[PDB]
């Protein structure tokens, strides 16, 4: 089993400054295809989550430019810039390199 840990528990309330968050991997998630497994989601409280990041520094369609996630090897980040709206949600990562599929831990957004 591979464990994913994200350190900040919530988000700062100010819509001016962007505060980047990050996950950490217990094992390197590079798969033998030459591709990684780290994702990033947003579960709005009351609604289903949605995809935001399908690979490290790759952005899903219909997603604003604030959402971008870098990472090299086992270290991983999520760069955040130009906080544009009050789109609340629950942030958590994904280990999809093996089984079982383990997510992050949750991070509230307000």
């Amino acid at each position: 089993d591979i464990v994913m840990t994200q350190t900040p528990l919530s988000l700062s309330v100010t819509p001016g400054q962007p505060a980047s968050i990050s996950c950490k991997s217990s094992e390197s998630l590079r798969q033998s295809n030459g591709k990684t497994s780290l994702y990033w989601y947003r579960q709005k409280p009351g609604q289903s989550p949605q995809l935001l990041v399908f690979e490290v520094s790759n952005r899903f369609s219909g997603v604003s430019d604030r959402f971008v996630g870098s990472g090299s090897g086992t270290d991983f980040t999520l760069r955040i810039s130009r906080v544009e709206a009050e789109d609340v949600g629950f942030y958590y990562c994904m280990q999809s390199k093996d089984f079982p599929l383990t997510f992050g831990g949750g991070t509230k957004v307000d």
């Binding site: 999809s96 390199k97 093996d98 089984f99 599929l101």
Partner: protein
């Protein structure tokens, strides 16, 4: 994430089964004699890999056995080579044990398979 579907004949696999059931998996091990999982000594490794393969293909061409897995020659089996019955060979014996049984008599049999091809005179 990678699952595992159906399972077919692996590489050695039938190495411990009997010689009646190991002669249905002959194509699996013939694929691996040349390909492999592969700067002047980088080339001498490759040329030996080619010439170990072509040495066994030319020897099958000396005989009648070119381009087939099971072939048949008209050399009689001398009953002093091994005198075992047909059911205790093809149903009660592996290929690793039969290889140790006639390891003495290998150069004698190859010399007769080659001679009976020069005695075609056709």
């Amino acid at each position: 994430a990678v699952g595992i579907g159906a399972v077919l004949f692996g590489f050695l696999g039938a190495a411990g089964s009997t010689m009646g059931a190991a002669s249905l998996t002959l194509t699996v091990q013939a694929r691996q004699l040349l390909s492999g999982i592969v700067g002047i000594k980088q080339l001498q490794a490759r040329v030996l890999a080619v010439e170990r393969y072509l040495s066994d293909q030319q020897l099958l061409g000396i005989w009648g056995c070119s381009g087939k897995l099971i072939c048949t020659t008209n050399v009689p089996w001398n009953s002093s080579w091994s005198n075992k019955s047909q059911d205790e060979i093809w149903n009660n014996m592996t290929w690793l044990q039969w290889d140790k049984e006639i390891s003495n008599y290998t150069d004698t049999i190859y010399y007769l398979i080659e001679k009976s091809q020069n005695q075609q005179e056709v």
